[PDB]
Design a protein around this ligand. Structure first.
Ligand SMILES: [Cl-]
Length: 248
């Protein structure tokens, strides 16, 4: 999958899926810029822009600055996100509000500052990282799954709005993935095997392929959706979860 010479932006690029994705675009030849709240590593194989995707003004400022110097934004990847868990009636107000400002507002702000650019150049590709929790109700994640469902719907209507301009807009929806947020947030030790088996009691199915996702495996799916191999694919959402939702 060749991306040589293309300008690619990736949010949440500091860790996990976003970092894996930004790195994959570099390994595919692209000119990559990663955006995130912090970049605490000592080095990054892409250019990096500190940015709070929930701060609508900061997004306007950084995008205006970078759009001044780039002809063309070939690929935008929305991968920012935060996970706040709890039963619906126990979730704190802060957790509810920041879940939405990040998981939905983040993209919203990026769309508001980039959609003119996509209309100007008349093409390119967008991929947004939703979640399996947007395809199926998840105990403990009512708010998180709902933000990712709003994100998906936002991204699809944006896709319909730009299709006249020839912009393809798609989503990937990951299941359980080996990340630092997932590792720490497990704590049950053999938690990785308990996830693969499933939790019948909470109506959460196991994983038929018998393994959890690797971040590179999400990133590769994004690269396909961003590439010209997917030249007739728009408004689709690919679930990457070993089959755990049985295709839902
Ligand atoms: Cl700035």
């Amino acid at each position: 999958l060749d991306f040589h010479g293309q300008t690619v932006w990736v949010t949440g690029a500091g860790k996990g899926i976003g970092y894996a994705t930004a790195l994959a675009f570099v390994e595919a030849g692209a000119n990559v810029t990663g955006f995130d709240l912090a970049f605490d590593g000592e080095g990054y194989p892409f250019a990096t822009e500190m940015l709070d995707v929930a701060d609508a003004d900061q997004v306007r400022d950084v995008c205006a600055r970078l759009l001044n110097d780039i002809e063309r934004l070939d690929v935008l990847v929305n991968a920012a996100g935060i996970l706040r868990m709890g039963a619906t009636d126990q979730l704190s107000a802060e957790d509810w509000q920041q879940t939405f400002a990040v998981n939905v507002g983040g993209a919203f702000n990026l769309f508001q500052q980039t959609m003119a650019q996509f209309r100007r150049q008349r093409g390119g590709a967008i991929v947004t990282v939703a979640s399996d929790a947007a395809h199926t109700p998840r105990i403990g994640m009512s708010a998180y799954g709902a933000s990712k469902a709003a994100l998906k719907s936002l991204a699809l209507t944006v896709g319909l709005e730009l299709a006249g301009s020839g912009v393809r807009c798609n989503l990937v929806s990951p299941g359980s993935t080996d990340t630092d947020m997932q590792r720490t947030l497990w704590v049950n030790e053999d938690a990785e095997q308990q996830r693969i088996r499933g939790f019948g009691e909470q109506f959460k199915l196991g994983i038929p392929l018998g393994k959890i996702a690797r971040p590179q495996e999400i990133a590769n799916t994004i690269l396909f959706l961003a590439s010209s191999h997917a030249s007739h694919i728009t408004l689709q959402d690919i679930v990457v979860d070993g089959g755990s939702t049985l295709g839902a």
